Design a protein around this ligand. Structure first.
Ligand SMILES: C[C@@H](O)[C@H](N)C(=O)O
Lengths: 100, 103
């Protein structure tokens, strides 16, 4: 009776002490895992941020190559039309000097 | 004394029980945060692979755009050479006919 009731409560106290020890080891294991994952997430968010800046940089660079090319084309076209006009001018002076 | 001995052990059992519940709650919060981190980890990893693929796609588009620009420049030079040759040949015909006329 009385001794048995007391030893049953002693045994429950020990069961709580051993479960507490187990949960302490598991909480320690979990904290190792959270810290490991937080080091990964922060490292991931950084490279994502660098890659977004990279994509926007390549997109800007493509608009720049197109802008330079369209200008190069316009300069070439202007220079060629003036060269053709120069030939026509020279031809007219030649005809004027030969035919008087 | 028998009663007092049991009641003192009862209070310790409450302290341990309450301490186990606090540790149970802490483990419950921790393992939930792990699961959220594992989800965010795969979500971020998926975006890294996307952005890397987007980078390689833009680099190929850039090289082909440069290649296309170089072809268009060569075709412009070709057409200009065509027109120069046509102008100079028309001026030579005009010369030949006008020198014939004044003969
Ligand atoms: C829980 C405890 O108080 C009880 N005496 C038992 O035997 O489990």
């Amino acid at each position: 009776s009385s001794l048995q009731r007391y030893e049953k409560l002693v045994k429950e106290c020990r069961r709580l002490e051993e479960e507490l020890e187990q949960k302490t080891h598991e909480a320690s294991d979990a904290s190792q895992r959270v810290r490991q994952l937080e080091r990964e997430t922060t490292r991931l968010m950084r490279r994502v941020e660098q890659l977004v800046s990279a994509v926007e940089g390549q997109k800007q660079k493509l608009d720049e190559t197109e802008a330079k090319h369209k200008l190069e084309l316009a300069e070439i076209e202007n220079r060629h039309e003036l060269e053709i006009q120069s030939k026509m001018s020279s031809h007219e002076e030649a005809l004027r000097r030969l035919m008087d």
